[PDB]
Amino acid sequence: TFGYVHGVSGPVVTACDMAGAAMYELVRVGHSELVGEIIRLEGDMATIQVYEETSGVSVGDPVLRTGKPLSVELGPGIMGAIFDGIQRPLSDISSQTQSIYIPRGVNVSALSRDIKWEFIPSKNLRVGSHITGGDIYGIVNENSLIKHKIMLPPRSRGSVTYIAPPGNYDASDVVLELEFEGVKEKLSMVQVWPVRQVRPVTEKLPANHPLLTGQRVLDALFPCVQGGTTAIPGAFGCGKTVISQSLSKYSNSDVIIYVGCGERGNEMSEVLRDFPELTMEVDGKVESIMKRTALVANTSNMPVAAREASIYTGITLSEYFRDMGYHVSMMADSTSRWAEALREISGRLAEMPADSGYPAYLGARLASFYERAGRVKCLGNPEREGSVSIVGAVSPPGGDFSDPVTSATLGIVQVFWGLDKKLAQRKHFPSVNWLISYSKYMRALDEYYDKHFTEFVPLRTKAKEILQEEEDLAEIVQLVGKASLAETDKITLEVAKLIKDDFLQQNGYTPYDRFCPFYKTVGMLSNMISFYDMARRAVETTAQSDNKITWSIIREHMGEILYKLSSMKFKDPVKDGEAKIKADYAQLLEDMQNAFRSLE
Amino acid sequence: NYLSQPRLTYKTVSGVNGPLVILDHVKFPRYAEIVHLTLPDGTKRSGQVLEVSGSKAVVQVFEGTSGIDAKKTSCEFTGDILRTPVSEDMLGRVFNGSGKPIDRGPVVLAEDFLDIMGQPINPQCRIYPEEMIQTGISAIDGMNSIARGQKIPIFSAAGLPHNEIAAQICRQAGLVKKENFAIVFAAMGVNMETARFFKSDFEENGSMDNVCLFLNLANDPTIERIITPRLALTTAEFLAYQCEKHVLVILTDMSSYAEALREVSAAREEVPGRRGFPGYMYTDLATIYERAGRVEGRNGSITQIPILTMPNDDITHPIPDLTGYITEGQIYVDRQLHNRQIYPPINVLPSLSRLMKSAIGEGMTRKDHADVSNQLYACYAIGKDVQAMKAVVGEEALTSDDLLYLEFLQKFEKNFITQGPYENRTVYETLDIGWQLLRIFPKEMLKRIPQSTLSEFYPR
Amino acid sequence: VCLFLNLANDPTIERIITPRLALTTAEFLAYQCEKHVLVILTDMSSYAEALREVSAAREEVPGRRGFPGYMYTDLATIYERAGRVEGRNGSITQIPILTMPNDDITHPIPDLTGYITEGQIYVDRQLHNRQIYPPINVLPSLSRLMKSAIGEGMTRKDHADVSNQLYACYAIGKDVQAMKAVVGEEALTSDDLLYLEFLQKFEKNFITQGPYENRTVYETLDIGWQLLRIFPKEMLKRIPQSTLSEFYPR
């Protein structure tokens, strides 16, 4: 059955009696069961790229073919797990070995056997029932927040021959058996999928609902859609944690995945230490986010293949959760460090350098990865929708976007939340540079906003214009001083500063800004822009008059409104009811209208 | 248990090619197996198998193949890869690149053998770096403080005094003292004068009972230069993670190590990657550098400071570039400061310890320290800006505020950065020097420091 | 219309044949069935990346940026299936579209396409950031066939002269803009400020157009002339005196 090692050169192991192998088939090499992928066939001989250090592999050692290409086990026990990029459970490789290392030659199963879970068979089914890929034949109650929907593997189909009754079961139990063309297939709560193959769908849909982060600058000026593709310039000086933590600890996304592409060893342990301590409110309970995630963490020294696979394991886990009818969201901490793993594997394959050193396929690997996002109709019969949102951080050298991974990423992603070291040095958290940043999903949210927030598109448009006008006016302020500007320009600059400091900026450590709902966000901006339009009305309406209104007169006779506008951030969704917040914001609208009427 | 089976020996040298000797008719060879070549004259040489294929075993000999032949040459195979004999007694001692001692002391009695290649530390088990190591150099400890478990390279350039800084860190380094700490200092491609300097300065200036010193000389054979970093880190892993010791690993010239990966990759006939380095150089430097951090349930901790000669002074070069991607900081040695005879010539502007805010603070050092370092950076930066302004406008055009930043700049280079080769300033002495400079300003000019911290420390 | 779609997560090597299938269908419709076919090829760059991949996989001799040596020929084998043929009323028109990498006009994808195509139309961030839709920058653009597609029997007599003078004034406008950006408006003559005003009025009126607005050539030419009238008649140094006498005063 299995082959034998014939030669080794660095990480590349040639084998013989590999006649029945396939290219990219997964193989165990050596008495220690080292992992590797076939990268050439030469007849009955095959060349295996080994992942771990080959030191001590011997000619004539066993070479067990795995019946699969590189693949992810999917099922119960994903939640709260920490995997590496080739789907090995780092929490269990710790606790089972009692060692601080990943031993060379791990053979621990990725979803831990013998751990029973409460399984409910779908009570609508019977023996002889017809079933297809993506049908939810049962649920596992593995955690209170996330009912794990089991489903028939996408390639499988047939008639139910037996289903397990309600009870406690694990990966070794034959939960389902079905027959097709006279052949029975046995199945388990564990499913397996090729990591480089997309999980198919009934239909990929146009994305049309906001991935609300609870962060004003993001949710208002640069909305990412659920299922959207987006990038963050992940660099130490700009606070990349602020977005990624806020997405996890609040945002409207049923399950989170986080992929360590290849992070610095300490910065990776920072994340793995810190995330378990985060909690989110559900059903008026407080609970650890480890109920709603799995972490695929690779430090820079994990094997080259484990770094380049990292995002493909991540997306595959994320698509499995998408096909349960969840709005999944997935971070990638540095697509640049994944792109280095591409450069290295192509270097070992001796493939020609394309752009700057990277492979020819870097753009295609990025693009065929990002296309795995979106909202979808799931496979199978219960008709559910789900999504995967991809938040791919990039790390351009010196901020230079001409960098191939960064350039191709900005080519493919529809949103860029351009964090900036300048704003972070000024403590302007969330420190998103609104001039550089953009979203291509504005059109796609028109349908949503027209229903729920029909005034908001006007408000967003005015807000960006007001901020852009202040950036142009600042050149005139440098040339000729603030005193030289027109009254309309001065009030625009003052309001743009108010928008910048009391709407874009948000202190996520405070109880009032730890999260910020969308209705709160709209109401705050509505007041600032209603004030702008009425202030500007009084100024322009008193063009050519004997007494002309100016920002200083507005501050003198109604600076209480400016103070109130700045104060609107303090309103608390816990201590204040939604109606109470809306009423206070409506009261500030009435207050400012009467104050403006005292001038014009 | 152990290799209870006897060692084979072959005369089957089917060829010799540069540094390689190709044995043939070999029985079940291992990749990376160590072999003991014997020349026709009986001279022993080590080698390791660099490739295997069927009956062939391509040994890279450690020394050059000078004197090998296809006939009288014989080649013993150990049956095993390179294991270091390791112990706590490797403290107080000096080793060549192969891990043979050279301090006239005996061979090491191993407390265990270890695989030199190591293993990846499990990312669940690595713990965040969270208390400072005192390096004693003020331009490090007051500006770029090192969290124990951080990796932070000293970038330098040819001719700069980075070897004197590396030695000064190796003598001075230790815990903060609000006993169980030991440097492992590993040096590669070292010219014999610089090797004497480390061996002599460490033996003389009090250090040895807390350091292990690995030397690979410039004329030591190039595979021993690849072995030395892994050898040193294997000792650091033993000291930290089995013996609970705190460790600082100092690697003296990662560029001379990159200059070895070139040769070994050429010995495998691999095509050269970016700037002629191996494509996998990122992974290889990661498998050096990430043998570091604290770990769950051990008091032990490995810091690293990779010293790294930027070729042609270029931060874009792969050796500093890849190292900047893998390590949580950088410290720049600067030719501008060295020519001014400032020693140690660390430039505190482009330098950054990314873990500083977790290294330092109340309980870990002193309450003010995190504030003072931000303020010293701001004053040095504004001082440099004003010094450039003076050169444009002439002294009489400077404001009183500018003249303060300029006086601070002058005193900061001549007292904060300047330290000399044997002045072991504690963090406390560095902070007191920080205040001795910052007190030059009016209290209200110190805008990065909190008013409470000023009220508690600005008074003398 | 017939849409051949290959998406970014479909197989990369199928992109090599995707535009060839389109052209084969276009040949059947045009040369066999006399249809007046237009062929749209979308992101020839994402096609060219499949050439670069196949090239690296085969170890073909690399030209600039690692495209195969045959890159020019492969692009010709796509781009030459165009134009009328004797006795057939069909007429394959091709409008390929390509995203230039790092915006670099001299990149091998645009550059080799440049040598093959009948001139090129350029779209620019310097227009798009200013919301000037469609962001077509006239200046770097040319059409090789415009020379014979215009003037009496095709378009109004003035058209060729107007086109050249619009390039002249737009280009001089960019040159005086580049001067103003260093030395200020005080260094510019009244004529240099008129060329700067020309560039501003030109982009706001001639290029700026609604996404559903259709303008005839005649309306485009009249916009051209009402802009050219910004200068005195004699300043229009690309235009002959006969064309000026028939078309300048209106």
């Binding site: 001796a350 020609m352 350098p353 | 006939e269 095509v271 050269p272 990657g273 | 170890e59 001799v61 690399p62």
Partner: peptide, 23 residues
């Protein structure tokens, strides 16, 4: 890189042919 890749492939071909010539 390309010139060295072709040199290395030519060497591999020459090695294979040289071993075939042992028969």
């Amino acid at each position: 890189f390309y010139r060295l890749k072709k040199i290395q492939e030519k060497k591999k071909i020459i090695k294979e042919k040289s071993e075939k010539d042992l028969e």
